[PDB]
Amino acid sequence: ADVQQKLAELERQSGGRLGVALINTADNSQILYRADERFAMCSTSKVMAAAAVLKKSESEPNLLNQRVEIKKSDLVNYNPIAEKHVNGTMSLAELSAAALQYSDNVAMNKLIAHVGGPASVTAFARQLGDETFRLDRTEPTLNTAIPGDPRDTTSPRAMAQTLRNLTLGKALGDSQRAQLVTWMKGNTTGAASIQAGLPASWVVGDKTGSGGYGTTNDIAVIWPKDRAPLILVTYFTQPQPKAESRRDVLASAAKIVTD
């Protein structure tokens, strides 16, 4: 309708490929634009890795307090928290926090390693119901986002359904569900993304992503002031190889689906 047209104008203006999936928990409504098309998650995948460790802590009490050694060799392209902890230790709750709130790649690599590799992260998604999610590489290789490459991708619909189950559903235990929500609420990297296109009185819990071919992503659990929660997934990719980041598109996409 009006929302499908408005998003198509935005996709045309941006000169790329936009994937939008919104779920309104009040009446179970959906706004779906390229919801089945495969997009490279890049850093939005970190949620699944955090949740896999969270699901693991249900059968492993005191798991999130277990210390993990941070060495100089572990350091990759972007590690804001891990670089401050070199030749020291970080707990699994701290690595989860660093990965979700500060987008630390070394922290994400430790989460992947702890569940048994990237295939075990994909194995956890099948356990929730997600048959689209796939993690084939570790950081930093998982953010290449080459057009046509199916490695490290998911569809906006599948990620929206999965985020709904993890943050609001029964995929994780009450204690674990509360922790993921708290971490995502404490995100620092999503100010100019989805949150930028929503009013200041709305409480947002999000994860952001940035990859090759101008890939700019954001997945969010939104609490509209005084109303039932929303799940929004805004995925965006560009044709040029070193195309600059366009977080404004995600803001406009969020604005179009809510306004």
Ligand X SMILES: *C(=O)N1C[C@H](NOS(=O)(=O)O)CC[C@H]1C(=O)NO[C@H]1CCNC1
Contacts to ligand X by CB under 6 A: 42-43, 77-78, 103, 105, 140, 143, 189, 208-212
For residue 258, the minimal CB distance to ligand X (Å) is 22
Angle, alpha carbons 19-24-30 (nearest 5°): 45
CB 219 within 8 A of CB 163: yes
Helix, strand, coil in percent for the chain, rounding step 5: 45, 20, 35
Angle, alpha carbons 91-139-203 (nearest 5°): 65
Cβ burial, residue 199 (10 Å; 0-12/13-18/19+): exposed
For residue 167, the minimal CB distance to ligand X (Å) is 18
- Among candidate residues 22, 20, 25, the one with its CA nearest the CA of residue 9: 20
Bridge partners for 211 per DSSP: 215
For residue 170, the minimal CB distance to ligand X (Å) is 28
For residue 245, the minimal CB distance to ligand X (Å) is 8
Comparing CB distances to ligand X, the nearer of 140 and 229 is 140
Comparing CB distances to ligand X, the nearer of 31 and 205 is 205
Comparing CB distances to ligand X, the nearer of 31 and 97 is 97
CB 226 within 8 A of CB 21: no
Comparing CB distances to ligand X, the nearer of 43 and 161 is 43
Annotation marks residue 29 as catalytic: no
Catalytic residue of the set 14, 43, 96, 103: 43
Strand ranges in 138-192 using DSSP code E only, listed in sequence order: 153-154
The residues annotated with a catalytic role in the active site are: 43
